[PDB]
Amino acid sequence: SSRWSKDYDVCVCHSEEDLVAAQDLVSYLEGSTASLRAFLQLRDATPGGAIVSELCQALSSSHCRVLLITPGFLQDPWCKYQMLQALTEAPGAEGCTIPLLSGLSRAAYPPELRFMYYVDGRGPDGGFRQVKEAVMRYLQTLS
């Protein structure tokens, strides 16, 4: 059998500042826990110019995604314009991301995020690791 069913299963979009974290948390599931194949596609230095790529269905082909960033960094226009896919430009119920926030009242993230999510991980309670528990709540769909 060569014909594949999907190209991407899980993607962890985060800053290189936590390259070790994303790889540490992903390593847990990669083992014999979730039995999935997650990949980290960090921003790469473009060759120069930049065009408007067609609808990236690949990003929507994924099942789940882990998003871990700061309230000050995510506040940037790049993160907002990039996360636009998770804001409104989403598939429907796939490629869902889990943005971790440290007790933010819509001060760091836009109002578009308004939904039945409720960002958790406020104060120094180990929000970083909490990202692993967040993705665990998504598996509930496979019950």
UniProtKB/Swiss-Prot annotation:
Modification after translation (UniProt): Phosphorylated by IRAK1 and IRAK4. Also phosphorylated by BTK. Polyubiquitinated. Polyubiquitination follows phosphorylation by BTK and leads to TIRAP degradation.
Tissue: Highly expressed in liver, kidney, spleen, skeletal muscle and heart. Also detected in peripheral blood leukocytes, lung, placenta, small intestine, thymus, colon and brain.
Subcellular location: Cytoplasm; Cell membrane; Membrane
One GO CC annotation: ruffle membrane
The keyword Transport appears for this protein: no
Keywords associated with the record: Cell membrane, Cytoplasm, Disulfide bond, Immunity, Inflammatory response, Innate immunity, Membrane, Phosphoprotein, Ubl conjugation
Disulfide bridge partners, by residue number: 11-56, 64-96
Predominant location: cytoplasm
Keyword Cell membrane assigned: yes
Biological process according to GO: 3'-UTR-mediated mRNA stabilization; cell surface receptor signaling pathway; cellular response to bacterial lipopeptide; cellular response to lipoteichoic acid; defense response to Gram-positive bacterium; inflammatory response; innate immune response; MyD88-dependent toll-like receptor signaling pathway
Assembly description: Homodimer. Also forms heterodimers with MYD88. May interact with PIK3AP1. Interacts with TLR4 and IRAK2 via their respective TIR domains. Interacts with BMX and TBK1. Interacts with EIF2AK2. Does not interact with IRAK1, nor TLR9. Interacts with TLR2. Interacts with RAGE/AGER. (Microbial infection) In case of infection, interacts with B.melitensis protein TcpB (AC Q8YF53); TcpB abolishes the TLR4-TIRAP interaction and downstream signaling.
UniProt note: domains: (Microbial infection) The TIR domain is structurally mimicked by the TIR domain of B.melitensis protein TcpB.
Name of protein: Toll/interleukin-1 receptor domain-containing adapter protein
Lineage, opening ranks: Eukaryota, Metazoa, Chordata, Craniata, Vertebrata
